[PDB]
């Protein structure tokens, strides 16, 4: 019942004892494995998760079964008996946010999990204070290009009340507009959110990197359109160290990866608005965002500019073009002094995280398909590491869009 | 409902209704997925046999016919009398093609219908086994115009040992464990190399020494057979524009021929059934030559390329690996040996998936194995959700016979 986990580059074996704690079920069954799928599908309820989280917390601080332990238990009981929900102590909030990141199986950057700035926004009312909470977050996390991990936790879900929601999937998004020639100008990923902005007031630009407004939702109100100050949104124009024409392509990306549409769950509590940010790995921008066929899809453009032989796959023009786009990314972020990490350094750090986590708690939930980079997969050590994927709590989950 | 499967490049949705027919269970549970792990009797045989027979008569559009009814009765009776049965010749050809069609980790399955099946079920010795393998190698190589083939040796039966090919492939380079602790040659082949020496083989000292075969007739120790050099087509590796690349002395062989998997058809088990197709360049260029535990040439090549190998952010590893794949493809094309690059191979597999959705309503596929080891998201299969499950007929891993 303890999975044997091998690394094939080295031969080392470990055993994942932690997978036995898997609180929730994943998509897989003995009959078929669905690990590749992106989205893979009363008061007595809330108590058992909430109780289980508090032991987690007090065990984490080497003070379990203690007087302070037993007092928080009867606190949350009576809180839930008197309100139907309960409130986290701020330190429990900090712990639960770090753990939820630590528990994310698809995040290659969890070497950084113990270093996360948590901003408590649980006292937030209305969308304007949302916007102010978000702008501080952005300015702290951006830090003039010396990026720092942060999360801002808005009021938890509670009965009878609506919900705090950020309609945008990220804090910084480029618009995608449809033409009558059928294509998209800008980021195809953001077509739907883009028209929602136009339909909620926004007047549309017409560039390929038009930063979107924020559609912020306070409980039981329609979302409100907010514009981010350009001086707030740090961007990196892309150039290549030796291909002088690359700059002319006009490519650019933003500094801050800030995911704003996932639900944060701690101890049976649910925070549908808790945006979190780190820094980018280069492949996210220069491979997926720019070269996915359903994203900016620039790979052929670049290949033409390199005078590559695009009429035969076996010249590997796609591979050569992709490598240079990633080199462009890394060189550009370093030139602008914006924190970036290349896929080799990142995956070597994740391996260190695996080792640390094997000692800390007997394993690490890891989703091989998302951990292995989208270029040079087998050139990184995570390709040769067997992984075990399971769901622990506290956690980040996807959720339905608000509309 | 069955698993809903999305292609993210196109937006399209399919439902893998075929997975509901999966028999032998895989290693995942609702509590934990292990899709990334490399290695994770009368009435039993009848249900296996009858389902296979049904698959056979379905394929030839004669399901429920008289011949179909009678063949089931015939199989049932033989199992009753003897505890086992024999495939008809046409069932063996069809079974072998279905085992390939069912292999979730094979990206070259667009070809599954084009498979030469050599029936060696009347094989009786290791010498005859060697002759069958040489004929297979000769046919499949075809002087570089590679043809997919499988040779099926006698099935397992009670009271008699198995035929086994001890080698993992028909062509494998020696891996000599060095007195340092290093390896000269292919480190993946240290074990089989040591068993060849121990069984009489006088070893070489090169990095690309072709191993002899150890062939196991039933209830015998393995016997050693040297492949005739002229039967083993090899490609010197050179680079189209990096002329020093030739001086690295690198070579690979032409024929990928897997010899240590068990072929299972209708409950019957063939422990020796070596099969071959042609290479996808990344198998050679990326895995065999650049894996750290294989030939591990990445740093040497990059150094020779005058790349800045002291910071990872130059992406010296990616650039050298690309040129090594370029060299492989260039060198096989120059030698006129069939080979397929990872873009063409993955594009053909998308066609296969679409065909199988129409033919059977699904297709078992191992995403981690189908996505190539370089340029993953540049290929279309990266953005294709897949469902992984076991159908029969199948090629299965089996314990090493020693
Ligand atoms: C600090 C630098 C970080 C790096 C380099 C990094 C890297 C990555 C990458 C490459 C992914 C895959 C995302 C995709 O492919 O679209 C990912 C996913 C994820 N990250 Fe991290 N990350 C970082 C910080 C964080 C932080 C601070 C948090 C939360 C506090 C976090 C939580 C997550 C979650 C929940 C996912 C899964 C989302 C999904 O399913 O796409 N990450 N990370
Ligand atoms: C004709 C061209 C073919 C191509 C291009 C091709 C391609 C591939 C590749 C790249 C792999 C991954 C192997 C690895 O990385 O270890 C693979 C696996 C596999 N191939 Fe194919 N193949 C071909 C022919 C065949 C044939 C003729 C058969 C059987 C009759 C076959 C059966 C398999 C099986 C069973 C696996 C899975 C092995 C495992 O699980 O390790 N292939 N194939
Ligand atoms: C290519 C497909 N991708 C764009 C899917 C979109 C997506 C969904 C999601 F829920 C995510 F958390 C996500 O995280 C990107 C990310 C987040 C953080 C904090 C750091 C880094 N470095 N990166 C990205
Ligand atoms: C890199 C590690 N890997 C190569 C392990 C070796 C291996 C194991 C295995 F079970 C296989 F089926 C295998 O077949 C590769 C193959 C087979 C055929 C018929 C065609 C092609 N083109 N390729 C190769
Ligand atoms: C279908 C497939 O799971 C999908 O393309 C996955 C594969 N691996 C990934 N890996 C990362 N890091 N990000 C992704 O979006 C994906 N997408
Ligand atoms: C641990 C991991 O599953 C293992 O290295 C797999 C990953 N995917 C693969 N895919 C293919 N085609 N070939 C392989 O050898 C592997 N190795
Ligand atoms: Ca029109
Ligand atoms: Ca008979
Ligand atoms: Cl992103
Ligand atoms: Cl191989
Ligand atoms: Gd030019
Ligand atoms: Gd040259
Ligand atoms: Zn699974």
CSV table of C-alpha atoms in Angstrom, one decimal, chain A residues 1 3-5 8-10 19-39 41 282 287-288 291-294 299 312-320 322-324 326-327 330-331 334 342-345 368-370 372-379 383-391, chain B residues 3-6 8-10 19-39 281 286-287 290-293 298 311-319 321-323 325-326 329-330 333 341-344 365 367-369 371-378 382-390:
chain,number,residue,atom,x,y,z
A,1,UNK,CA,0.0,0.0,0.0
A,3,UNK,CA,4.0,3.0,-3.6
A,4,UNK,CA,7.6,2.2,-4.6
A,5,UNK,CA,9.1,5.3,-6.3
A,8,UNK,CA,16.0,5.9,-13.2
A,9,UNK,CA,18.9,8.2,-13.6
A,10,UNK,CA,20.4,7.3,-10.3
A,19,UNK,CA,0.0,9.2,-0.1
A,20,UNK,CA,-2.1,7.3,2.5
A,21,UNK,CA,-3.3,10.7,3.9
A,22,UNK,CA,-5.0,11.5,0.6
A,23,UNK,CA,-8.0,13.2,2.0
A,24,UNK,CA,-10.0,13.4,-1.3
A,25,UNK,CA,-10.3,11.2,-4.4
A,26,UNK,CA,-8.7,11.9,-7.8
A,27,UNK,CA,-9.9,10.8,-11.2
A,28,UNK,CA,-8.2,7.5,-11.6
A,29,UNK,CA,-9.4,4.0,-11.1
A,30,UNK,CA,-7.9,0.5,-11.4
A,31,UNK,CA,-9.6,0.3,-14.8
A,32,UNK,CA,-8.2,3.5,-16.4
A,33,UNK,CA,-5.8,6.3,-15.5
A,34,UNK,CA,-6.9,9.9,-16.2
A,35,UNK,CA,-3.8,11.7,-15.0
A,36,UNK,CA,-3.4,13.6,-18.2
A,37,UNK,CA,-6.8,15.4,-17.9
A,38,UNK,CA,-6.5,19.1,-17.0
A,39,UNK,CA,-9.8,19.3,-15.1
A,41,UNK,CA,-14.3,15.7,-13.8
A,282,UNK,CA,11.0,30.8,-18.6
A,287,UNK,CA,7.2,27.9,-24.8
A,288,UNK,CA,3.5,27.7,-23.7
A,291,UNK,CA,4.3,29.0,-29.0
A,292,UNK,CA,1.2,27.0,-28.1
A,293,UNK,CA,-0.8,26.8,-31.3
A,294,UNK,CA,-3.9,28.1,-29.4
A,299,UNK,CA,6.9,29.8,-33.5
A,312,UNK,CA,10.4,19.7,-43.7
A,313,UNK,CA,9.8,18.7,-40.1
A,314,UNK,CA,13.1,16.8,-39.9
A,315,UNK,CA,15.2,20.0,-40.0
A,316,UNK,CA,13.8,20.5,-36.5
A,317,UNK,CA,13.0,24.2,-37.3
A,318,UNK,CA,10.3,24.2,-34.6
A,319,UNK,CA,12.8,23.0,-32.0
A,320,UNK,CA,15.5,25.5,-33.0
A,322,UNK,CA,11.5,27.4,-29.7
A,323,UNK,CA,15.0,27.3,-28.0
A,324,UNK,CA,15.8,30.8,-29.2
A,326,UNK,CA,13.2,30.8,-24.6
A,327,UNK,CA,16.7,32.3,-24.8
A,330,UNK,CA,15.7,34.6,-20.2
A,331,UNK,CA,18.0,37.2,-21.6
A,334,UNK,CA,17.7,39.3,-16.8
A,342,UNK,CA,15.0,28.6,-16.3
A,343,UNK,CA,13.5,25.1,-16.6
A,344,UNK,CA,16.9,23.5,-15.8
A,345,UNK,CA,17.4,25.4,-12.5
A,368,UNK,CA,4.6,14.3,-13.6
A,369,UNK,CA,2.9,15.8,-16.6
A,370,UNK,CA,3.0,19.3,-15.2
A,372,UNK,CA,8.3,17.9,-16.6
A,373,UNK,CA,9.0,21.1,-18.7
A,374,UNK,CA,7.4,21.5,-22.1
A,375,UNK,CA,10.7,21.7,-23.9
A,376,UNK,CA,13.8,19.5,-23.2
A,377,UNK,CA,11.8,17.2,-21.0
A,378,UNK,CA,14.3,14.4,-20.6
A,379,UNK,CA,17.2,16.9,-20.3
A,383,UNK,CA,11.8,13.4,-16.3
A,384,UNK,CA,13.5,10.4,-14.8
A,385,UNK,CA,11.7,10.6,-11.4
A,386,UNK,CA,8.7,8.5,-10.8
A,387,UNK,CA,6.0,10.5,-9.0
A,388,UNK,CA,2.8,9.8,-7.0
A,389,UNK,CA,-0.1,12.2,-7.5
A,390,UNK,CA,-2.7,12.6,-4.7
A,391,UNK,CA,-4.8,15.4,-3.1
B,3,UNK,CA,-14.3,9.7,-19.5
B,4,UNK,CA,-14.6,13.0,-21.4
B,5,UNK,CA,-11.4,13.8,-23.3
B,6,UNK,CA,-10.4,17.2,-24.5
B,8,UNK,CA,-6.7,21.8,-26.0
B,9,UNK,CA,-5.1,22.9,-29.3
B,10,UNK,CA,-8.4,22.6,-31.2
B,19,UNK,CA,-12.0,2.2,-21.7
B,20,UNK,CA,-15.0,0.7,-20.1
B,21,UNK,CA,-14.0,-2.6,-21.7
B,22,UNK,CA,-10.6,-2.6,-20.0
B,23,UNK,CA,-9.8,-6.0,-18.4
B,24,UNK,CA,-6.6,-6.3,-16.4
B,25,UNK,CA,-6.4,-3.5,-13.9
B,26,UNK,CA,-3.8,-0.8,-13.8
B,27,UNK,CA,-1.9,0.7,-10.9
B,28,UNK,CA,-4.0,3.8,-10.1
B,29,UNK,CA,-6.8,4.2,-7.5
B,30,UNK,CA,-9.0,7.2,-6.6
B,31,UNK,CA,-6.6,7.9,-3.7
B,32,UNK,CA,-3.4,8.1,-5.9
B,33,UNK,CA,-2.4,8.0,-9.5
B,34,UNK,CA,0.7,6.1,-10.5
B,35,UNK,CA,0.6,6.6,-14.2
B,36,UNK,CA,4.2,7.8,-14.1
B,37,UNK,CA,5.6,4.4,-12.8
B,38,UNK,CA,7.6,2.6,-15.5
B,39,UNK,CA,6.9,-0.9,-14.2
B,281,UNK,CA,14.9,10.0,-33.9
B,286,UNK,CA,17.7,12.4,-27.0
B,287,UNK,CA,17.4,9.3,-24.8
B,290,UNK,CA,21.8,12.3,-24.0
B,291,UNK,CA,20.4,10.4,-21.0
B,292,UNK,CA,22.8,10.9,-18.1
B,293,UNK,CA,22.8,7.2,-17.4
B,298,UNK,CA,25.4,16.3,-24.0
B,311,UNK,CA,25.2,28.7,-16.7
B,312,UNK,CA,22.0,26.8,-17.4
B,313,UNK,CA,20.3,30.0,-18.6
B,314,UNK,CA,22.2,29.9,-21.9
B,315,UNK,CA,20.2,26.8,-22.6
B,316,UNK,CA,23.3,25.0,-23.8
B,317,UNK,CA,21.7,21.7,-23.0
B,318,UNK,CA,18.7,22.3,-25.2
B,319,UNK,CA,20.8,23.6,-28.1
B,321,UNK,CA,20.5,18.2,-27.8
B,322,UNK,CA,18.7,19.7,-30.8
B,323,UNK,CA,21.8,19.4,-33.0
B,325,UNK,CA,18.8,15.0,-33.0
B,326,UNK,CA,19.6,16.9,-36.2
B,329,UNK,CA,18.0,12.4,-38.7
B,330,UNK,CA,20.6,13.7,-41.2
B,333,UNK,CA,18.5,10.0,-44.2
B,341,UNK,CA,11.3,12.6,-36.5
B,342,UNK,CA,9.2,13.4,-33.4
B,343,UNK,CA,7.0,15.9,-35.2
B,344,UNK,CA,5.9,13.6,-38.0
B,365,UNK,CA,-2.6,6.0,-24.6
B,367,UNK,CA,0.6,10.5,-22.3
B,368,UNK,CA,4.0,10.5,-20.5
B,369,UNK,CA,5.3,8.0,-23.1
B,371,UNK,CA,4.9,13.0,-25.7
B,372,UNK,CA,8.5,13.0,-27.0
B,373,UNK,CA,11.4,13.8,-24.7
B,374,UNK,CA,12.4,17.1,-26.3
B,375,UNK,CA,10.0,19.8,-27.6
B,376,UNK,CA,7.0,18.2,-25.9
B,377,UNK,CA,4.5,21.0,-26.2
B,378,UNK,CA,5.6,21.7,-29.8
B,382,UNK,CA,1.0,17.3,-25.8
B,383,UNK,CA,-2.3,19.1,-25.8
B,384,UNK,CA,-4.3,15.9,-26.3
B,385,UNK,CA,-5.8,14.4,-23.1
B,386,UNK,CA,-5.5,10.7,-23.1
B,387,UNK,CA,-6.9,7.7,-21.2
B,388,UNK,CA,-4.6,4.9,-20.2
B,389,UNK,CA,-5.9,1.3,-19.8
B,390,UNK,CA,-5.1,-2.3,-20.7
